[PDB]
Amino acid sequence: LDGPYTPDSSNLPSNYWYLINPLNDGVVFSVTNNSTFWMFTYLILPNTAQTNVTVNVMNETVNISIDNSGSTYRFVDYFKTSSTQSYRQRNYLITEHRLQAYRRDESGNISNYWGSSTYGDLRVGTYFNPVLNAVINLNADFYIIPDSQQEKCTEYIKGGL
């Protein structure tokens, strides 16, 4: 819709969907308030055997295991809620397209798509962990779709550009 825009980090406005279309796998999204929420999304390519990988995200070194082995992409969310904690895997998106999208509401809650494009179980999920006014890192090219057109965003997630 509006875009494409190059990767960027900033205090993104609320009530917009940022539809990311990543050139690269790995970390494509991240945000933290450095207090009670750290979140990133890792893009796993198709046919990825089980691998332990080390990434640098928001000034921390992180070790995670990734597995796909499917024909489809997997966008996997990770989060932790205290500094000394390790990140744990949470929800994920299985999809034949290089698309995931993020929205922050007026309370600071991050939403993104969970489930799949393939299986008929696509959901708008929310992590009820406010990070209002935190910088959001979009490590991907992206489009911007207003909340009023949320239905259109879902169509791209499910169907591709």
Residue numbers in the entry: 65 to 225
What does the paper say about this structure?
For rotaviruses (RVs), which are the major causative agents of life-threatening gastroenteritis in children under the age of 5 years and result in 453,000 deaths worldwide annually, recognition of specific cellular glycans for initial cell attachment is mediated by the distally located VP8* domain of the spike protein VP4. Although structurally conserved with a galectin-like fold, sequence-wise VP8* is the least conserved among RV structural proteins contributing to a phylogeny consisting of 37 [P] genotypes9. Our crystallographic analyses provide the structural basis to explain the unique glycan specificity exhibited by a neonate-specific bovine-human reassortant RV strain and its parental bovine strain, each belonging to the P genotype. We have shown that P VP8* exhibits a novel glycan-binding site that adapts to a differential recognition of precursor glycans, which are the core elements of HBGA and human/bovine milk glycans.
To understand how the genotypic sequence variations alter the structure and influence the glycan specificity in the neonate-specific P HRV, we determined the crystal structure of VP8* of a P human neonatal RV strain N155 isolated from a neonate with severe gastrointestinal disease in India28. As in other VP8* structures, the P HRV VP8* adopts a galectin-like fold with two twisted antiparallel β-sheets consisting of strands A, L, C, D, G, H and M, B, I, J, K, respectively. The two β-sheets are separated by a distinct cleft, which constitutes the glycan-binding site in the VP8* of ARVs and P HRV. This cleft is noticeably wider in the P HRV VP8* than that in the ARV VP8* structures or the P VP8*; however, the width is similar to that observed in the VP8* of the globally dominant P and P HRVs. Consistent with its distinct glycan-binding profile, the structure-based sequence alignment of representative VP8*s shows that the residues at the known Sia or A-HBGA-binding site are altered significantly in P HRV N155. For instance, R101 in the VP8*s of ARV and P HRV, which is critical for glycan binding, is altered to a phenylalanine, whereas the conserved Y188 and Y189 are replaced by glycine and threonine, respectively, in the P HRV VP8*. In addition to these amino acid changes, which may impact glycan specificity, there are significant structural alterations in the P HRV VP8* structure, particularly in the I-J and J-K loops, which may also influence glycan specificity. A distinguishing feature of the P VP8* is that glycan binding occurs in a previously uncharacterized binding pocket and the binding cleft is noticeably wider. Based on the currently available VP8* structures, a structure-based analysis of the VP8* sequences indicates that the wider cleft strongly correlates with a deletion at position 135, and a significant change at position 101, which is a conserved arginine residue contributing to glycan interactions in the VP8*s with a narrow cleft27.
